[PDB]
Design a protein around this ligand. Structure first.
Ligand SMILES: CCCN(CCC)C(=O)c1cc(C)cc(C(=O)N[C@@H](Cc2cc(F)cc(F)c2)[C@H](O)[C@@H]2NCCN(Cc3ccccc3)C2=O)c1
Length: 390
């Protein structure tokens, strides 16, 4: 690992998001910021909110610049309205650089901030094409690269604990690493495999094959990417296109049929619990996602375990049972490879080479019999046809 200053700079959990500490303004104002590869705006709470114990105070920053422009961002989950400006931004546990970046000062929000998440803002790491108001508002990472010598690349190691973290534990626990400008080898085992970034807007990728315990889900691969497939740290679940979700659930139910689970479980709404330590991991199937490789007619696969797609949750009775929620859900906006999927891997966002790399995470949760995996190569034909076109 050559980036020790950035290793272990993340806190949080899949259910409430992973955040990195940042400073805004002069003198610096410290804020915890949600790492979101699924959006492109840098925005921070800038007015009192019931879920915020701190916020950006523009009148206290000598370097604050008002853009005299409003901004609105509607996410899948919630939304916020704010005021645009720029100011000096740093990442304490990151590259030792200070950059002037666009900042949306959040003045109004609905279902955006999360009670107890400990974060007060969001760092949209995707491309300008999806930035609000429009693509002229330069994203933070673009500013970082244009203004410094930092390589146009970042990597994420999201670490799920494999068990419930209470309010105090999640504040003291290391949730992962965001390596800005590089790849730290201590964060993964084995080889890194790269899939093409199809288009620079979201971190869009193409899934060419899906397996549940080695069994081909056998759908037209275009279904897997309808209307797109993205890598998104800002979403908890693996979200799948309606038809793929239905087929995936049917297959996961069949593989786990030795035990019956209530419909509420499969809807990702109700928890299932087992006596401490008795979770029957082995009855649940591994899920393999084949991704287009960088070599013509070649793919590789990432394999996740139920330790990734079953999300640890505290029993409504706080008992000693090990409880979980099914972290795979239905999408109407394409595949979303959320945090529970990213927790199994070290993910490299190689903007410079327009590719996303995957390697087995040194912190993924597993058992003595199975491990997450990244394997290749596989002969795969007509992968370009798996991509969706409106
Ligand atoms: C329940 C609270 C949020 N959580 C738990 C903690 C992560 C989720 O798992 C979750 C679930 C859904 C169904 C949607 C989003 C969601 O909208 N995520 C977006 C970011 C986000 C994180 C939050 F913690 C709260 C929010 F309100 C929003 C992300 O950019 C997502 N990524 C894919 C594209 N879009 C839409 C979009 C399109 C263009 C530009 C910007 C955003 C998105 O919103 C997040």
């Amino acid at each position: 690992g050559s980036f020790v200053e950035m290793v272990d700079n993340l806190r949080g959990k899949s259910g409430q998001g992973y955040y990195v500490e940042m400073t805004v303004g002069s003198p610096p104002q410290t804020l915890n910021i949600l790492v979101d590869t699924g959006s492109s705006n840098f925005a921070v709470g800038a007015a009192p909110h019931p879920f915020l114990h701190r916020y950006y105070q523009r009148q206290l920053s000598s370097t604050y610049r008002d853009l005299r422009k409003g901004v609105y961002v509607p996410y899948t989950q919630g939304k916020w309205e704010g005021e645009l400006g720029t100011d000096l931004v740093s990442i304490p546990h990151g590259p030792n650089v200070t950059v002037r970046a666009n900042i949306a000062a959040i003045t109004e929000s609905d279902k955006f901030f999360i009670n107890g998440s400990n974060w007060e803002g969001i760092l949209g790491l995707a491309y300008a094409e999806i930035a609000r108001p429009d693509d002229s508002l330069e994203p933070f990472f673009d500013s970082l690269v244009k203004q410094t010598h930092v390589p146009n690349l970042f990597s994420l190691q999201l670490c799920g604990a494999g068990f419930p973290l209470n309010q105090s534990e999640v504040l003291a626990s290391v949730g992962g690493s965001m390596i800005i400008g590089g790849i730290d080898h201590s964060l993964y085992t084995g080889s890194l495999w790269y899939t093409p970034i199809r288009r620079e807007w979201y971190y869009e990728v193409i899934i060419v094959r899906v397996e549940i315990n080695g069994q081909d889900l056998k759908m037209d691969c275009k279904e897997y990417n309808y209307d797109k497939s993205i890598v998104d740290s800002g979403t908890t679940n693996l979200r799948l296109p309606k038809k793929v979700f239905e087929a995936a659930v049917k297959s996961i139910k069949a593989a786990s049929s030795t035990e019956k689970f209530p419909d509420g479980f499969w809807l990702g709404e109700q928890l299932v619990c087992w006596q401490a330590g008795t979770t029957p991991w082995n009855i649940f199937p591994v899920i393999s996602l084949y991704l287009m490789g960088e070599v013509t007619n070649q793919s590789f696969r990432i394999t996740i375990l139920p330790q990734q797609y079953l999300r640890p949750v505290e029993d409504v009775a706080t008992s000693q049972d090990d409880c979980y929620k099914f972290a795979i859900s239905q999408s109407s906006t394409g595949t979303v490879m959320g945090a529970v999927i990213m927790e199994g891997f070290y993910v490299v966002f190689d903007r410079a080479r327009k590719r996303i790399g995957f390697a087995v995470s040194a912190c993924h949760v597993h058992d003595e019999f199975r491990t997450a995996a990244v394997e290749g190569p596989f002969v795969t034909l007509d992968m370009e046809d798996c991509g969706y076109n409106i």
